[PDB]
Homo-oligomer: A and B are copies of this chain.
Amino acid sequence: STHEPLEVLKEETVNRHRAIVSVMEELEAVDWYDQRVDASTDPELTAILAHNRDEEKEAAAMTLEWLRRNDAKWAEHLRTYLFTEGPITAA
């Protein structure tokens, strides 16, 4: 799953890889859950996909907080733009 050999990567780089790829899979799942919620024709199934959808968002937030704590630039940029107002392209 890593493009470079494990012998040359820093231990922190591999851990962030494990954390980043997790966020990717969680973000991807939220998108697919949400699409199937709109297209679903069974309300009982829609409730399940909607419930798991929101649980993926929670998992994404957790891993993102971990990235924020173990990466200086994630902390800088996340603090710059998240929980703000006005244009997002200037903060």
Contact = CB atoms under 8 A, between A and B. Distances in A.
A13 B61 CA distance: 19
A10 B34 CA distance: 10
From A11, A22, A61, A63, name the one whose CB has the most chain B CB atoms within 10 angstroms.
Answer: A61
SS class of chain A's interface: helix, strand, loop or mixed? helix
Q: In which size bucket is the chain A interface?
A: 35 or more
10 closest Cβ pairs, A-B complex:
A4-B39, A1-B3, A61-B77, A52-B59, A65-B81, A20-B31, A58-B77, A61-B81, A54-B73, A8-B39
Given A22-B48, A25-B29, A44-B87, 10 more contacts: A3-B35, A20-B30, A21-B27, A22-B52, A44-B70, A48-B89, A51-B59, A52-B63, A57-B77, A60-B77
